[PDB]
């Protein structure tokens, strides 16, 4: 199999920057080289084929060069909607083989999260479980710390987090943290709080509620 | 319109996957069709191709397990994969090869079919409201949502007010709990002034169990 070595594997750049992704084939592949762009959750999109032919409708800021074994994708004047994983693909011989991808993240200014907390619903409690949700909305960068306190006692091993992909317009992230307790545990204690630490917050933000209030 | 349409499927281990790629806007006697898969978090992997004249090529490591068929009258290409293993869990794509077998461009792709290989049984989701309160009210904006808990396999799709509500919607990637069941949440930020007058309904579709749930999020 023809090995395609793609570099870098992850890259962060600002809007308007020029970015460069390289791809090296282990054998001569002439110009049978394609660049793909894949947004999270979606099918890959064709950017360039025959190493340097821009597919119709693709913005002119995308460009491909090279022939033989060394190939380059250039994105001039990066735009927020260009966050994606990019792949090169050779098709001179079977099996077709891909580079292992380049994840392109968009750099922007620090944005502190707005924090919200949701008690468990009466419907969920009726089934005997209690999930408490803490929401961090529209922040940057991705790094954030969410600590759960029940009656001021630090929780561990009973919460899970999930983060969205970068927004296509403002390049921010959102995050949920879910604390799941037994119904009996939830009904014993009163004060539930999530404390959020983030680079955009001069001091940690705590959102809390008192059960049944 | 040139389209390639492939639903999500659970396959038990050692059993057989059948994927259908139904094409429109072009003839299967003029274009080839490629099959490509992508495990969660990993790179694309090429599987097979059937050319317009019927020639076929398979990934060498998987050739014994793969077969392709074509039905031109139905505009369908069918990929069969036997002896499925949990490492075969992936999103499977079909894609058109515009050109010939030598020079071509993979210009149009199917939406992709999430295939899960697991001995676990299908389960529909429970949908719970994340109610807006003073605890979810920043200034003039309120946050609300839906908790979609305990389903298998992936995926679920979530919309709000039948697609009318899109701005400020965040549907998070699903989390796998130790039980082997998935959970996710979908949230939206709205004007607090609207809580008493505007209806907010999350529309949850879990095709693998044919489950559809509409849950209104009542203000507290």
Q: Domain-by-domain residue ranges, chain B?
A: 3-117, 126-216
Within 8 A of B104 by CB-CB distance, chain A residues are 49, 91
* B139 burial level (CB within 10 Å; 0-12, 13-18, 19+): exposed
Q: What is the CA radius of gyration of chain A?
A: 23
Residue in chain A closest to B144 (alpha carbons) equals: A118
Within 8 A of B133 by CB-CB distance, chain A residues are 118-119, 209
CA distance A124 to B127: 9
CA distance A147 to B113: 37
Distance from CA of B33 to the nearest CA of A (A): 13
Distance from CA of A132 to the nearest CA of B (A): 9
CA distance A48 to A88: 9
Q: Output DSSP code: residue A157.
A: S
Is domain B3-117 classified as CATH 3.30.70.20? no
Sheet strands (E) in A50-128: 53-54, 62-66, 70-75, 84-90, 97-98, 102-107, 114-118
Distance from CA of A174 to the nearest CA of B (A): 7
Q: Is residue A23 a contact partner of residue A97, using CB atoms and an 8 Å limit?
A: no
Sheet strands (E) in chain B: 3-5, 9-11, 17-24, 32-38, 45-50, 56-58, 66-71, 76-81, 90-99, 104-109, 113-117, 126-130, 137-138, 141-151, 157-160, 169-171, 175-176, 182-191, 201-206, 211-216
- Indicate yes or no: CB of A131 within 8 angstroms of CB of B112: no
DSSP-based three-state secondary structure for B139? coil
Residue A14 has φ and ψ, to the nearest 5°, of -90, 160
Report the topology of domain B126-216. Answer: Immunoglobulin-like (2.60.40)
- Indicate yes or no: CB of B57 within 8 angstroms of CB of A124: no
Closest-CA residue to A175 (of B164, B180, B152, B143): B143
- Indicate yes or no: CB of B185 within 8 angstroms of CB of A133: yes
Residue in chain B closest to A124 (alpha carbons) equals: B128
Give the Cβ contact number of residue A207 at 10 Å: 20
CA distance B11 to B13: 6
Within 8 A of B45 by CB-CB distance, chain A residues are 98
Residue in chain A closest to B137 (alpha carbons) equals: A116
Q: Residue B106 is nearest to which of A1, A46, A114, comparing CB atoms?
A: A46
Residue A187 has φ and ψ, to the nearest 5°, of -75, -15
Within 8 A of B49 by CB-CB distance, chain A residues are 94, 96
Give the Cβ contact number of residue B185 at 10 Å: 25
Host H or E run for residue A125: helix A122-126
b/e for A86-95, b at 16 or more Cβ within 10 A? Answer: bbbbbbbeeb
Q: Is residue B49 a contact partner of residue B56, using CB atoms and an 8 Å limit?
A: yes
Distance from CA of A36 to the nearest CA of B (A): 9
A114-210 homologous superfamily: Immunoglobulins (2.60.40.10)
- At how many Å resolution was this determined? 2.0
Identify any residues that bridge with B189 across adjacent strands, giving them in sequence order. B143
CA distance B122 to B34: 29
Q: Is residue B127 a contact partner of residue B204, using CB atoms and an 8 Å limit?
A: yes
- Cα B158 to Cα B84, B112, B212, distances in angstroms: 29, 18, 10
Cβ within 8 Å of A, B 85-124: 93, 95, 103-107, 109-112
Q: Is residue A91 a contact partner of residue A32, using CB atoms and an 8 Å limit?
A: yes
The experimental technique behind this entry is: X-ray
- Indicate yes or no: CB of A162 within 8 angstroms of CB of B45: no
- Indicate yes or no: CB of A87 within 8 angstroms of CB of B107: no
Structure tokens at B42: 């990993």
- Indicate yes or no: CB of B145 within 8 angstroms of CB of A44: no
Identify any residues that bridge with B33 across adjacent strands, giving them in sequence order. B50, B96
The class of domain A4-107 in CATH terms is: mainly beta
Within 8 A of A45 by CB-CB distance, chain B residues are 109
- Indicate yes or no: CB of B172 within 8 angstroms of CB of A162: yes
How many Cα atoms occupy the beta-carbon half-sphere of A166 within 13 Å? 24
Closest-CA residue to A75 (of A47, A109, A45): A47
Give the Cβ contact number of residue A84 at 10 Å: 24
- Contacts for B15 with CB less than 8 Å, ≥ 6 apart: B84
Q: Residue B60 is nearest to which of A95, A164, A207, comparing CB atoms?
A: A95
B101 — alpha (psi -120 to 50), left (phi > 0) or beta?
A: alpha
Structure tokens at A139: 């922040």
- Contacts for A174 with CB less than 8 Å, ≥ 6 apart: A113, A135, A136, A137, A138, A139, A163, A164, B170, B172, B187
Q: Would you say the CATH fold of B126-216 matches that of B3-117?
A: yes
């Amino acid at each position: 199999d023809i090995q395609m070595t793609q570099s870098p594997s992850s890259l962060s750049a600002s809007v308007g920057d020029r970015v460069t992704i390289t791809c090296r084939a282990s054998q001569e592949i002439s110009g049978y080289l394609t660049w793909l762009q894949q947004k999270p959750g979606k099918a890959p999109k064709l950017l360039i084929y025959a190493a340097s032919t821009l597919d119709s409708g693709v913005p002119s800021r995308f460009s491909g060069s090279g022939s033989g074994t060394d190939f380059t994708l250039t994105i001039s004047s990066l735009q927020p909607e260009d966050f994606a994983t990019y792949y090169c693909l050779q098709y001179t011989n079977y099996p077709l083989t891909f580079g292992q991808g380049t994840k392109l993240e968009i750099k922007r200014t620090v944005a502190a999260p707005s924090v919200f907390i949701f008690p468990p619903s009466d419907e969920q409690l009726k089934s005997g479980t209690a999930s408490v949700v803490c929401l961090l909305n529209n922040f940057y960068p991705r790094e954030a710390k969410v600590q759960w306190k029940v009656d001021n006692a630090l929780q561990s091993g009973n919460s899970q987090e999930s983060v969205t992909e970068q927004d296509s317009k403002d390049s921010t992230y959102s995050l949920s943290s879910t604390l799941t307790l037994s119904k009996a545990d939830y009904e014993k204690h009163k004060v539930y709080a999530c404390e959020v630490t983030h680079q955009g917050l001069s001091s940690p933000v705590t959102k809390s509620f008192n059960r049944g209030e | 319109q040139v389209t390639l349409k492939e639903g999500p499927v659970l396959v038990k281990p050692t059993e057989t996957l059948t994927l259908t790629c139904t094409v429109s806007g072009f003839s299967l006697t003029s274009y080839g069709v490629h099959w490509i898969r992508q495990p969660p978090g990993k790179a694309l992997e090429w599987l097979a191709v059937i050319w317009a004249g019927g020639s076929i090529s398979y990934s060498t490591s998987l050739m014994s397990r793969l077969t392709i068929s074509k039905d031109t009258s139905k505009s369908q290409v069918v990929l069969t994969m036997t002896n499925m293993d949990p490492v075969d869990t992936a999103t499977y794509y079909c894609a058109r090869a515009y050109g010939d077998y030598v020079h071509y461009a993979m210009d149009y792709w199917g939406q992709g079919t999430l295939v899960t290989v697991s001995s676990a049984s299908t389960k529909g989701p429970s949908v719970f409201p994340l109610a807006p309160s003073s605890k979810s009210t920043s200034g003039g904006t309120a946050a609300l949502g839906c908790l979609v808990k305990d389903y298998f396999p992936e995926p679920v799709t979530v919309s709000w007010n039948s697609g009318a509500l899109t701005s400020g919607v965040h549907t998070f990637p699903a989390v796998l709990q130790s039980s082997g069941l998935y959970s996710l949440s979908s949230v939206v930020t709205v004007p607090s002034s609207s809580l008493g007058t505007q209806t907010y309904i999350c529309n949850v579709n879990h095709k693998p169990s044919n489950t559809k749930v509409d849950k209104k999020v009542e203000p507290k």
